[PDB]
Amino acid sequence: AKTRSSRAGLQFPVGRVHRLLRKGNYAERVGAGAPVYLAAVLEYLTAEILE
């Protein structure tokens, strides 16, 4: 699978989250797992609200 969400088994965009973390002036560098973790958390909260 190409998309990083598919690798992480998520419906939210890991690539977009990584890009925002980088172009958000949050830190000099952004780990590889931070976008995955944040996408998973956002997906969980979205599902929790939508249920």
Add this chain to the structure above:
DNA sequence: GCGCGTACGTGCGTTTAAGCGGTGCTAGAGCTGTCTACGACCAATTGAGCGGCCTCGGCACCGGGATTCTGATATCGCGCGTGATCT
């Protein structure tokens, strides 16, 4: 506004443990050196996401109907008071 009653406040006595000074021990926070692997950066490219258009059906509108339901009165039942009868 009035009246009650009781529950905090003020004060004195007793008790507890906070506080201060002192010494000891070591746990971990900080610093230093070294090294590796993770991420930024770059290039290529292709595919996921977005804009737009179309179809359709979920829901907003309107009309008619069922359903509470809120308030009063009144009827009926129950309770209290007064009158009549019996003991």
